[PDB]
Design a protein around this ligand. Structure first.
Ligand code: CLA
Ligand code: CLA
Ligand code: CLA
Ligand code: CLA
Ligand code: CLA
Ligand code: CLA
Ligand code: CLA
Ligand code: CLA
Ligand code: CLA
Ligand SMILES: CCCCCCCCCCCCCCCC(=O)OC[C@H](COP(=O)(O)OC[C@@H](O)CO)OC(=O)CCCCCCCCCCCCCCC
Lengths: 73, 80, 165, 144, 741, 73, 63, 39
C-alpha cells in the first residue's frame, strides 16, 4: 500500500522475520523498508507485476490469495 | 539377487569359473564347442557382481553377463 | 567509419595511450645512469614502443573509444575498406599451413600403413620418409583436390567399424 | 561320493585372535565353516588379517561370509596343494555343504551337472527393452 | 659374517642397442605398442625396479645407479644456481647494501615484450627478484666476488660428471653384490661417523677459518673489496690473531684440554646478531663442532669386522615385553631385504625433518640479512613444508607397497606387525572417532563464530573478548624458554629464539624477529592443523593396514597394490586399493599444508613482520590476526580478499608474470576436476566417435587410441589439482610478499 | 555461469554509468576476476565483521554456505 | 572343406563384435557341427587385449 | 651409430627437436619483426 505511492524510493518487503537467534543488532539491522520489525526485502519482482496488472490495496492481494488457495484445494 | 547368464558363444575355456571368487559358476557337458564343456550359473544367490568372470571371458562379445539385481546380504558381501 | 570506429592515426585515446606508455617507461628510465645496461635496455624498449605505435597507425587499423585497435572479420568490409590484412590473409595463411601439416601426417600414416609393423613406424619416426613427405607437402591443396575428385580421399561405409545401433 | 558331515570337535589352527573375526551376523543370520586336511604344520595367512599355523591333519575355521572361505580355499589349494571344503551354518544348527558342490571342483567338467541360466543365443540376438516393458517388475531383456 | 667389498665385473655391456627398443625392462612392454595405453605404461613402470625382475641384487644395483644419476642432476642444479649468481646476478652490489637492494639472479631476453619482467631490483641491475635465499647463504659462507661463485659452478659441473660416471661404472663395470648392500651395520657406522660427522667437522673448519673472519669484517663496516681473501686468512696467524686472540695460541689449547681459551669464536651468545639479524656464526661454528663430535662418537656403535660394536638383530630381539608377544623378531630381515620398507621409514623421517627445518628456520634465522627479507622467509618456510608433506605421503605409499609385495606371513607370526594387522579394525575405528571429534571441535568453533557474528552476537563467540580458549601450555612453555638463560642455562647469554619473549630485534627499519603471542585464534588454528594431520594419517594408515585384506575384499593382496577396483559388486568397490588411499591422502595433505602456510603467512604479516616507526612498531596488516582469524569470513575477507590485491593488479609491473600464473594456476586446478569427476567409459566412447571420423578420411593411426585408465585418470586429476592449488598459492604469496615486503 | 556473469557485469557497468569499464576489461580474464568478481564482493563479505554487522550479513552467510556445500559435493 | 580357406582374409558381419566391418585372417575352420567354427585372428586387439575369435559360417564374408 | 640414430628417431626426441626448431623460428621471426599484429 505504501510502495505503490512511491515505487522509486521505497524498497519492497517480502515477509517478516521471526528468528529467536537474532540479537539486538540483527533486529535493528534487518528493520528496514518502513516496517516495524525485521523483514526481508523482496527481489522476485512480484510488486511491479501486481501493481501493473491492477493491484492497488492489500485487500486485492488478500482476495487473490484466498481465491488461489481455494483453487489449489 | 544378480542375474548371471551364459550365452552360446561360450568356448568352454573354464577361465570364468576360476576367476569367480564366490563359487557361482561351474562347467557342465555340452556339444557346441570343441572342449565339449559350457559354463553354468546354478548358485547365483551368492553372486556379488564383481564382474571378474566378465573380465576373464575371452570371447567377443562376452559369453557370461552379470546384471545387477535386488541387493541382499549375500549380494552386498556384508560380514555383519 | 565502420561500426562507429575511427582510424588509429586520428584517435586521441590512441595518442594518449602511447604517451602513457612512453611516460611510464621514461619515468622508470630516469632512475638509472646514461651509459649503463638498464638504460640502453629501456631506450631499446622505448624505440620498440614508438615503432609499434607508428606501424599500427601506418597500417590503417581502426581504433575504438579505448584507443586500442579493432579487427574486421567480415570479408566484404575487409576487402572494401582496406582491412584484408587483419582477418582474411592470415586466415588463408593458417589454412595453408594447417592443411600442409595435416596432409604430411596423412601421407606418412598411409605410407607406413602397408608395412609389416606400422606401430614401430609410429613410435619411432622414419626421418627420411617423413622429411621427404614434409618437403613434398608444398602442393597439398592441389593433391587434396585431385584426391577428392578421384574419390580416393574418403573410405567406403562398409570398411569402417560402427556400433551395434 | 557322499556329502561330508561337519565335525564340531575338529581342532583349529593356532591363531592368537583378531578384530576381523565373526560379528553379530554369525549369531543372528548365518556364518561359514571351512575344513581341510593338512599334511604338516605350516604358517598360512588368515583372510581377515594375521598369520596362523595350520595343524597336521583336520583343521576347522569360522568366517563371516562365503568369500572369505573361498579365498582361504584358493590360497590353500594354490600355495600348499590341499583339498578344502566349506559349509554354511545357521543359528539353529543347520549345516549346508557348499563347495565343492558335487565333490569335484567346478573348473573341471563333471558328469551329472545340469547347466542353468544359459541362453541358447548370443548377446546381439537379445530383444529390445520395449518388448519386455510393462511386466510384473523391472525385467531386463536378457532375463528371458 | 665378514664385511668386505663384493663386486661383479662387467655385468651389463655399455651399448645403445637397448635405447632403440622402448619398454625392454618389462616382459609385457617388450612386445611393442598396439594401443596408446602402452605408451603411458612405458612411463609408469620405468622406475618400478621390483617389477622388471625378482632378483634383489639387480634391484639394488639399479637403485645405486639411480641414486648416482639423481645426485648428478642435483649437482647440475646447484652449479646452475652458482653460475646464475656469478654471471646474471647482483650479488656484488647486494653485498654493499643488503638492506635496500633486492636479490636477483635471473634476466630475461628482450623478446615479445617480456622485458617488463626485468624490474629494477636495485644496485644498477634489472631482473627478477629471487626468494631462494642464495644471496644470504653466500654472504654467510664468506663469498665476496663473482669469481668464487663461477669457480663453484665449474666445480659443481665436474661433480655432476663424476656422479654420472660413478653411476655408469657401478652399473656396467663394477656392480656390487647383494651381500655388500646388506651391510647395514657398516653402512650406518659410515653414514654416522664419516658422512654426518666429517661433513659437520669440515663445515666447522670452513666457518671458523672463512665465514667467521670475513663475516666479522663485513659486520665491522669493512668494504668487501678490502677484506682479505680466505686463503690470506688461512695462511697467516697475524690476521686471525688480531680478529680472534685465541688464534695466537694455535691448536695448543685443544690438545691441552684448555678449550676455554677458544671462548672468542666458540660461544653461546644466543638470540640474533643486532647488525645482520641472523644467528651468530660463532654459535653456528661451535654448534657444528659439537655436532661433528656427537656424530663421530655415534659412528662407532655397530660391529663391522671386529668384536666390539653392536648387532642390530641382537638389540631388536632383546626388546620384548609381556604386552607385545615376540617383539621385533624378523624386523631386521624385513628392513635388510625390502627397499620399499626402508623407503617408507626414510621418507617419513625425512619429511618430518623437512617440516622441522622450516619451523626452525623462520624462528631462528641463521643467515645474515635473512629475517629482514620477508619474501625469502615466507617462500622458504612454505617450500620446505610442502616438500615434507609430499615426502610423508610417499612414506605411507611405500609402506603400503611393502605390505602388498614384500610382506610374508611365514616370518611374522607373533611380532608387532602381525598384532597390528590383527587389531587394525580397532586402530582405524579409534582414529576415525578422534578425527570426527577433532573435526567437530575444530570446525564447529569457526562455524559458531560466523553464526554469532552474523546474528549480531559478538559476545557469544570464541575470541579474546568473548569466551576465550587460551593455549596455557604453549604460553607456559614460551615463558620457560624465555627464563631458561637465567636458571637452567647459566652458560647461555640469551635465549634460543626471540619468539619466546623479551626484546625484539630490528635491522634496517624492518623487524627481524619479535616475540610471538598466542591467543584464541592460535588455539583454534592449531586444533585445525591437528585435525587435518589426523585425517591424513587416518587415510594413509587405513591404506597401509588394509592393503592385504579387508572385511569387504579378503584377497586384496592378490589384486596388487595399484588396481582400480574389484567391480561394482558388493554395492561398489571403487577405490579399495592402497594406491587410492595414497591418492586421497594427497588431497588431504594439500588441504592440511595449505591451511598451515595460510596461518604462517597471516601470523607473520600480522604480528611479526612490519616496519619500525618512532615509538612503536607497525605491522603489515595491523595486528588483525587476534581479532579476525576466528571466523571463516575473516580468513576470506582480510586474508584472502585483501591480500590478493597485489597479485591481481600486478599487470604492467615486474610482478605481472605472477598474476598470469595466478590465472594459469586457476585453470590447471579446475582442469583437474575433469579427470576427477568423470570416468573413462564416456571418454572411450567419445574416442570411438573421433576414431570413426579419422577412419572416414583414412587418417586413423595404427596405434589404437584408448582412453586413460582409471588409475591414470585419478593420478592425472590429483597431479593437476596439486599443481594448480600449489601454483595459485605460490603466485599469491610471492606477489604479495614482494610488493609489500 | 558465463551468461549470468556477462549479464551482471554489463548491466552493472551500465547502471553505474561507466560502460567503458566493461568494454575495456571484458577482453582479458584478469579484468573479469578483479574488476567484476573482486571489486563487487567488497560489500558482500563485509556483512559481518568484528566491528558489527548490517542487513547484508545474511548474504555473506549464504555466500559461505554455498561455498561449504560446493566443497562438500 | 566347408567355409573359408585357411590363411585368407574375411570381413566380420557380427554387429556386436569389436571387429565389425573389419578384415581378419582365417586361422582354422572346425569340421564339426559347432555354431562358430571359423577362427579369425586380427592384427588390432580389442579392449580386453584379445586378437582371436570364433565366428559362424554366415557371420564372415570374403573380402 | 644405427642404434643411436634409431633412438634419436623416437617420438620424444623428434618432438623435442621439432618443437625447439619451431619455437626458435617463431622467436627469431618475432625478434627481427617486432610486434606483428597485421599483414
Ligand atoms: C560467415 C558468415 C557471414 C556473415 C554473417 C556475413 C555478413 C555480412 N556480409 Mg559477408 N561474406 C561471407 C560471409 C559472411 N558474411 C563470405 C564467406 C564471403 C566470401 C564470398 C562474403 C563476402 C561478402 C561481400 C562481398 C559483402 C559481404 C557483405 C556482408 C554484410 C551485409 C550483406 C549480407 O548480410 O548478406 C550476405 C553476404 C553475401 C551473400 C555475400 C554477397 C554480398 C551481398 C550480395 C551484399 C551486397 C549488397 C550491398 C553491397 C549491401 C550493402 C548495402 C549498403 C550498406 C550499401 C553482412 C554483415 C557486404 C558488405 O557489407 O560490404 C561491405 C558485401 O558486399 N560479404
Ligand atoms: C596425421 C595427424 C592428424 C590428422 C590429419 C587429423 C585430422 C583430424 N582430426 Mg585429429 N588428432 C590427432 C592427429 C590428426 N588429426 C592427434 C595426434 C590427436 C591426439 C591429440 C588428435 C585428436 C583429435 C580430436 C579429439 C579430434 C580430432 C578431430 C580431427 C578432424 C577435425 C580437424 C581437426 O583439426 O581437429 C583437431 C586436431 C587435433 C586436436 C590434433 C592435431 C595434432 C597435430 C597438429 C596433427 C599432427 C601431429 C603429428 C605428430 C604429426 C605427424 C608426424 C609425422 C609427419 C612423422 C580431422 C579429420 C576431431 C574429430 O573428431 O573429427 C571431426 C576431434 O574431435 N583429432
Ligand atoms: C652413454 C653411456 C650409457 C649407455 C650407452 C648405457 C646403456 C644402457 N643402460 Mg645405462 N647408465 C649410464 C650410462 C649408460 N647406459 C649412467 C651414466 C647411469 C647412471 C645414471 C646408468 C645406469 C643404468 C641403470 C640402472 C640401468 C641402465 C640400463 C641400460 C641399458 C638400457 C637402458 C637405456 O639405455 O635406455 C635409455 C634410458 C634413458 C634415455 C633415460 C635416461 C634418463 C637420465 C638417466 C636422467 C635424465 C634426467 C632428466 C634430464 C630429468 C627429467 C626432467 C625432464 C623434464 C627432462 C642400456 C644398454 C638398464 C638396463 O641395463 O636394463 C636392465 C638399467 O636398469 N643404465
Ligand atoms: C665415510 C664413508 C661414506 C660416505 C661419506 C658415504 C656417502 C654417501 N653414500 Mg655411502 N656407503 C658407505 C660409506 C659412505 N657413504 C659404505 C661403507 C657402504 C656399504 C655398506 C655404503 C653404501 C651406500 C649405498 C647403498 C648408498 C650410499 C649412498 C651415499 C650418498 C647419500 C647421498 C646423500 O644424501 O648424501 C650427500 C651427498 C653428497 C655429500 C654428494 C657428494 C658426494 C661426495 C663425493 C661423497 C662421496 C664419499 C664416498 C665415500 C665416495 C668416495 C669413494 C671414492 C671411491 C670416490 C652419500 C654421498 C647412496 C648413493 O648411492 O648415493 C649415490 C646409496 O644408495 N652408500
Ligand atoms: C676438518 C676441519 C678443519 C681443517 C681442515 C682445518 C685446517 C687448518 N687449521 Mg683448524 N680448526 C678446526 C678445524 C679444521 N681446521 C676446528 C673445528 C677448530 C676449533 C677447535 C680449529 C681451530 C684452529 C686454530 C686455532 C688454528 C687452526 C689452524 C689450521 C691450519 C693449520 C693446521 C695446523 O695447525 O697444523 C696442523 C698440521 C697438519 C694439519 C698436517 C697437514 C698434513 C698435510 C696436508 C700432509 C700433506 C702431505 C703430502 C703427501 C705432501 C706431498 C705433496 C707433494 C706435491 C710434494 C689448517 C689449514 C691454525 C691456523 O690456521 O693458523 C691461523 C690455527 O692456529 N685451526
Ligand atoms: C625417495 C622418493 C621416492 C622414490 C624413490 C619412489 C619410488 C617409486 N615410487 Mg613413489 N612416491 C613418492 C616418492 C618416491 N617414490 C612420493 C613423495 C609420493 C607422493 C606423491 C609417491 C607416491 C607414489 C605412488 C602413488 C606410486 C609410486 C610408485 C613408485 C615406484 C614406481 C616408480 C614410479 O613412480 O613410476 C614412474 C614415475 C613417473 C611417471 C614420474 C611422474 C611424473 C609426475 C606425474 C610429474 C610431477 C609434476 C612436476 C613436479 C611438475 C612439472 C610441471 C609440468 C608443466 C612439466 C617406485 C619404486 C608407484 C608404484 O608403487 O609402483 C607400483 C605408485 O603407484 N609412488
Ligand atoms: C568442505 C567439504 C568437506 C567437508 C565438510 C568434509 C567433512 C568430513 N570429511 Mg571430507 N573430503 C572432502 C571435503 C569435505 N569433507 C573432499 C573434497 C574430499 C576428497 C579428497 C574428502 C575426502 C575425505 C576422506 C578420505 C575422509 C573425509 C572425512 C571427513 C569427515 C571427518 C570428520 C570430521 O571432520 O568431524 C566433523 C564433521 C565436520 C567438520 C563436517 C561439517 C559438520 C558441520 C560443521 C556441523 C553442523 C551441524 C549442524 C548443526 C547440523 C544441523 C542440520 C540441520 C539442517 C538439522 C567429515 C564429516 C574422513 C572421515 O571419514 O571421517 C573420519 C575421511 O577419511 N573426507
Ligand atoms: C562442535 C563445535 C561447537 C561447540 C564446542 C559449541 C559450543 C557452544 N555453542 Mg554452538 N554451534 C556450532 C558448534 C559448536 N558449538 C555450530 C557448527 C553451529 C552452527 C549450526 C552452532 C550454533 C550455535 C547456536 C545458535 C548457539 C550455540 C551455542 C553454544 C554454547 C552453548 C550450547 C549448549 O549449551 O548446548 C548444550 C550441550 C550439551 C547438552 C552437551 C555438551 C557436551 C558434553 C559436555 C560432552 C560430554 C561427553 C563426556 C566427555 C563423556 C564422558 C564419558 C563418560 C566417562 C561419562 C556452547 C559453548 C549457544 C550460544 O550462543 O551460547 C551463548 C547458541 O545460541 N551454537
Ligand atoms: C588461437 C589464439 C591466438 C592467436 C590467434 C594469436 C595470434 C597472434 N599472436 Mg598470440 N598468444 C596466444 C594465442 C594466440 N595468439 C597465447 C595462448 C599466448 C600465451 C602463450 C600468446 C602470446 C603471444 C605473445 C607474447 C605475442 C603474441 C603475438 C601474436 C601475433 C603474432 C603474429 C606473428 O606471429 O607474426 C607472423 C608469423 C609468421 C609470419 C609465421 C608464418 C609461418 C610460416 C613461416 C609462413 C607460412 C605462411 C603462409 C598474432 C596476431 C605477438 C604480438 O606481437 O602480438 C601482436 C606477441 O608478442 N601472442
Ligand atoms: C600412550 C601410551 C603408550 C602405550 C604403551 O606403549 O605402553 C607400553 C606397553 C608395553 O609394551 P611392551 O612392554 O610389551 O613393549 C616392549 C616391546 O614392544 C619392545 O619395547 O605397550 C602397549 O601397551 C602396546 C599397546 C598399545 C596401548 C594402547 C593405548 C592407547 C593410547 C594411545 C593414545 C595416544 C594419545
Amino acid at each position: 500500500e505504501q510502495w505503490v505511492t512511491d515505487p522509486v524510493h521505497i524498497r519492497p518487503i517480502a515477509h517478516a522475520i521471526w528468528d529467536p537467534h537474532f540479537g539486538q543488532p540483527a533486529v535493528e539491522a534487518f528493520t528496514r523498508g518502513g516496517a516495524s520489525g525485521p523483514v526481508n526485502i523482496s527481489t522476485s519482482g512480484v510488486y511491479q507485476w501486481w501493481y501493473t496488472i491492477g493491484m492497488r490495496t492489500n485487500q486485492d492481494l488478500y482476495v487473490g490469495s484466498v481465491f488461489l488457495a481455494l483453487v489449489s484445494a | 539377487a544378480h542375474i548371471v547368464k551364459i550365452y552360446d558363444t561360450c568356448i568352454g575355456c573354464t577361465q570364468c569359473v576360476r576367476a569367480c571368487p564366490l563359487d557361482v559358476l561351474e562347467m557342465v557337458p555340452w556339444d557346441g564347442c570343441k572342449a565339449s564343456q559350457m559354463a553354468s550359473a546354478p548358485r547365483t544367490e551368492d553372486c556379488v557382481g564383481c564382474k571378474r568372470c566378465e573380465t576373464a571371458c575371452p570371447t567377443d562379445f562376452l559369453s557370461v553377463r552379470v546384471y545387477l539385481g535386488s541387493e541382499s546380504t549375500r549380494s552386498m558381501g556384508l560380514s555383519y | 567509419d565502420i561500426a562507429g570506429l575511427t582510424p588509429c592515426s586520428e584517435s586521441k585515446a590512441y595518442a594518449k595511450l602511447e604517451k602513457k606508455e612512453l611516460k611510464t617507461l621514461e619515468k622508470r628510465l630516469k632512475q638509472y645512469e646514461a651509459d649503463s645496461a638498464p638504460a640502453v635496455a629501456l631506450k631499446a624498449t622505448m624505440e620498440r614502443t614508438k615503432a609499434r605505435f607508428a606501424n599500427y597507425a601506418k597500417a590503417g587499423l581502426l581504433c575504438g573509444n579505448d584507443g586500442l585497435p579493432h579487427l574486421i572479420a567480415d570479408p566484404g568490409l575487409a576487402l572494401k575498406y582496406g582491412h584484408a590484412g587483419e582477418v582474411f590473409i592470415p586466415t588463408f595463411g593458417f589454412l595453408y599451413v594447417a592443411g600442409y601439416i595435416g596432409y604430411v601426417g596423412r601421407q606418412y600414416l598411409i605410407a607406413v600403413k602397408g608395412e609389416a609393423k606400422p606401430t614401430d613406424k609410429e613410435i619411432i619416426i622414419d626421418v627420411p620418409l617423413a622429411t621427404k613427405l614434409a618437403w613434398q607437402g608444398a602442393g597439398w591443396p592441389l593433391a587434396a583436390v585431385q584426391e577428392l575428385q578421384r574419390g580416393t580421399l574418403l573410405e567406403k561405409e562398409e570398411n569402417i567399424t560402427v556400433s551395434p545401433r | 561320493w557322499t556329502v561330508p558331515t561337519l565335525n564340531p570337535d575338529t581342532p583349529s589352527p593356532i591363531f592368537g585372535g583378531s578384530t576381523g573375526g565373526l560379528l553379530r551376523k554369525a549369531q543372528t543370520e548365518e556364518f561359514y565353516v571351512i575344513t581341510w586336511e593338512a599334511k604338516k604344520e605350516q604358517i598360512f595367512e588368515m583372510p581377515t588379517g594375521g598369520a596362523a599355523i595350520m595343524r597336521q591333519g583336520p583343521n576347522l575355521l569360522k568366517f563371516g561370509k562365503k568369500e572369505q572361505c573361498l579365498a582361504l580355499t584358493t590360497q590353500l589349494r594354490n600355495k600348499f596343494k590341499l583339498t578344502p571344503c566349506f559349509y554354511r551354518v545357521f543359528p539353529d544348527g543347520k549345516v549346508q555343504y557348499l563347495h565343492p558342490a558335487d565333490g569335484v571342483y567346478p573348473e573341471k567338467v563333471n558328469a551329472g551337472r545340469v547347466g542353468a541360466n544359459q541362453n541358447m543365443r548370443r548377446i546381439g540376438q537379445n530383444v529390445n527393452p520395449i518388448k519386455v516393458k510393462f511386466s510384473g517388475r523391472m525385467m531386463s531383456p536378457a532375463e528371458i | 659374517k665378514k664385511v668386505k667389498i663384493a663386486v661383479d665385473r662387467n655385468p651389463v655391456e655399455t651399448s645403445f642397442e637397448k635405447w632403440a627398443k622402448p619398454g625392454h625392462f618389462s616382459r609385457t612392454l617388450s612386445k611393442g605398442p598396439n594401443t596408446t595405453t602402452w605408451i603411458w605404461n612405458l612411463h609408469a613402470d620405468a622406475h618400478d625396479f621390483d617389477s622388471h625382475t625378482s632378483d634383489l641384487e639387480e634391484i639394488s644395483r639399479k637403485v645405486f645407479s639411480a641414486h648416482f644419476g639423481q645426485l648428478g642432476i642435483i649437482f647440475i642444479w646447484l652449479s646452475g644456481m652458482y653460475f646464475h649468481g656469478a654471471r646474471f646476478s647482483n650479488y656484488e652490489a647486494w653485498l654493499s647494501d643488503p638492506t635496500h637492494i633486492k636479490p636477483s639472479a635471473q634476466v630475461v631476453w628482450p623478446i615479445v615484450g617480456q622485458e617488463i619482467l626485468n624490474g629494477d631490483v636495485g644496485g644498477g641491475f634489472q631482473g627478477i627478484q629471487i626468494t631462494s635465499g642464495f644471496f644470504q647463504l653466500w654472504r654467510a659462507s664468506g663469498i665476496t666476488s663473482e669469481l668464487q661463485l663461477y669457480t663453484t659452478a665449474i666445480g659443481g659441473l665436474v661433480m655432476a660428471a663424476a656422479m654420472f660416471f660413478a653411476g655408469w661404472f657401478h652399473y656396467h663395470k663394477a656392480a656390487p653384490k647383494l651381500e655388500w648392500f646388506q651391510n647395514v651395520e657398516s653402512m650406518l657406522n659410515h653414514h654416522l661417523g664419516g658422512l654426518l660427522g666429517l661433513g659437520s667437522l669440515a663445515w666447522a673448519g670452513h666457518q671458523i677459518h672463512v665465514s667467521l673472519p670475513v663475516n666479522k669484517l663485513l659486520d665491522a663496516g669493512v668494504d668487501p673489496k678490502e677484506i682479505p681473501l680466505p686463503h690470506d686468512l688461512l695462511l697467516n696467524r697475524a690476521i686471525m690473531a688480531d680478529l680472534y686472540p685465541s688464534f695466537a695460541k694455535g691448536i695448543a689449547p685443544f690438545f691441552t684440554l684448555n678449550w676455554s681459551e677458544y671462548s672468542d669464536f666458540l660461544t653461546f651468545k644466543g638470540g640474533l646478531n643486532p647488525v645482520t639479524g641472523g644467528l651468530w656464526l660463532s654459535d653456528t661454528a661451535h654448534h657444528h663442532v659439537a655436532i661433528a663430535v656427537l656424530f663421530l662418537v655415534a659412528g662407532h656403535m655397530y660391529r663391522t669386522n671386529w668384536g666390539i660394536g653392536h648387532s642390530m638383530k641382537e638389540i631388536l630381539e632383546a626388546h620384548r615385553g609381556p604386552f607385545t608377544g615376540e617383539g621385533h623378531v624378523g624386523l631386521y630381515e624385513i628392513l635388510t631385504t625390502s627397499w620399499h620398507a626402508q623407503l617408507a621409514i626414510n621418507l617419513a623421517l625425512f619429511g618430518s625433518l623437512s617440516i622441522i627445518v622450516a619451523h626452525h628456520m623462520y624462528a631462528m634465522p641463521p643467515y645474515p640479512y635473512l629475517a629482514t627479507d620477508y619474501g625469502t622467509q615466507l617462500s622458504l618456510f612454505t617450500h620446505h613444508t610442502w616438500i615434507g608433506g609430499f615426502c610423508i605421503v610417499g612414506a605411507g605409499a611405500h609402506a603400503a607397497i611393502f605390505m602388498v609385495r614384500d610382506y610374508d606371513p611365514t616370518n611374522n607370526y607373533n611380532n608387532l606387525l602381525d598384532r597390528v594387522i590383527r587389531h587394525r579394525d580397532a586402530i582405524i575405528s579409534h582414529l576415525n572417532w578422534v578425527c570426527i571429534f577433532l573435526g567437530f571441535h575444530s570446525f564447529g568453533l569457526y562455524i559458531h563464530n560466523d553464526t554469532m557474528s552474523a546474528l549480531g552476537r559478538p559476545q557469544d563467540m570464541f575470541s579474546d573478548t568473548a569466551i576465550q580458549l587460551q593455549p596455557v601450555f604453549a604460553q607456559w612453555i614460551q615463558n620457560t624458554h624465555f627464563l631458561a638463560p637465567q636458571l637452567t642455562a647459566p652458560n647461555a647469554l640469551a635465549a634460543t629464539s626471540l619468539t619466546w619473549g623479551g626484546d625484539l630485534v630490528a635491522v634496517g627499519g624492518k623487524v627481524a624477529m619479535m616475540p610471538i603471542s598466542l591467543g584464541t585464534s592460535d588455539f583454534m588454528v592449531h586444533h585445525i592443523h591437528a585435525f587435518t594431520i589426523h585425517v591424513t594419517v587416518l587415510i594413509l594408515l587405513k591404506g597401509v593396514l588394509f592393503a592385504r585384506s579387508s572385511r569387504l575384499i579378503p584377497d586384496k593382496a592378490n589384486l596388487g597394490f595399484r588396481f582400480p577396483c574389484d567391480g561394482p559388486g558388493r554395492g561398489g568397490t571403487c577405490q579399495v586399493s592402497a594406491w587410492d588411499h595414497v591418492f586421497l591422502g594427497l588431497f588431504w595433505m594439500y588441504n592440511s599444508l595449505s591451511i598451515v602456510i595460510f596461518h604462517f603467512s597471516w601470523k607473520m604479516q600480522s604480528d611479526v613482520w612490519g616496519t619500525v616507526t618512532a615509538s612503536g612498531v607497525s605491522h603489515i596488516t595491523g595486528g588483525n590476526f587476534a581479532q579476525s582469524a576466528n571466523t571463516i569470513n575473516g580468513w576470506l575477507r582480510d586474508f584472502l580478499w585483501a591480500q590478493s590485491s597485489q597479485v591481481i593488479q600486478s599487470y604492467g609491473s615486474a610482478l605481472s608474470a605472477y598474476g598470469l600464473i595466478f590465472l594459469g594456476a586457476h585453470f590447471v586446478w579446475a582442469f583437474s576436476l575433469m579427470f576427477l569427476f568423470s570416468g573413462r567409459g564416456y571418454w572411450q566412447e567419445l574416442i570411438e566417435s573421433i576414431v570413426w571420423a579419422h577412419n572416414k578420411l583414412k587418417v586413423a593411426p595404427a596405434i589404437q587410441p584408448r582412453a586413460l585408465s582409471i588409475t591414470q585418470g585419478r593420478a592425472v586429476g590429483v597431479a593437476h589439482y596439486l599443481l594448480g592449488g600449489i601454483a595459485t598459492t605460490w603466485s599469491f604469496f610471492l606477489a604479495r610478499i614482494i610488493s609489500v615486503g | 555461469g558465463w551468461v549470468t556473469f556477462y549479464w551482471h557485469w554489463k548491466h552493472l557497468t551500465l547502471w553505474q554509468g561507466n560502460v567503458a569499464q566493461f568494454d575495456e576489461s571484458s577482453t582479458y580474464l584478469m579484468g573479469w576476476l578483479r574488476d567484476y568478481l573482486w571489486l563487487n564482493s567488497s560489500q558482500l563479505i563485509n556483512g559481518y565483521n568484528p566491528f558489527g554487522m548490517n542487513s547484508l550479513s545474511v548474504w555473506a552467510w549464504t555466500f559461505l554456505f554455498g561455498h561449504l556445500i560446493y566443497a562438500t559435493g | 572343406e566347408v567355409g573359408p580357406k585357411r590363411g585368407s582374409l574375411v570381413k566380420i558381419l557380427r554387429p556386436e563384435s569389436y571387429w565389425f566391418n573389419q578384415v581378419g585372417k582365417v586361422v582354422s575352420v572346425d569340421q564339426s557341427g559347432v555354431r562358430y567354427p571359423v577362427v579369425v585372428r586380427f592384427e588390432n586387439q580389442n579392449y580386453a587385449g584379445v586378437t582371436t575369435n570364433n565366428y559362424a559360417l554366415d557371420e564372415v564374408v570374403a573380402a | 651409430m644405427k642404434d643411436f640414430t634409431t633412438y634419436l628417431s623416437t617420438a620424444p626426441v623428434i618432438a623435442t627437436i621439432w618443437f625447439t626448431f619451431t619455437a626458435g623460428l617463431l622467436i627469431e621471426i618475432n625478434r627481427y619483426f617486432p610486434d606483428p599484429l597485421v599483414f
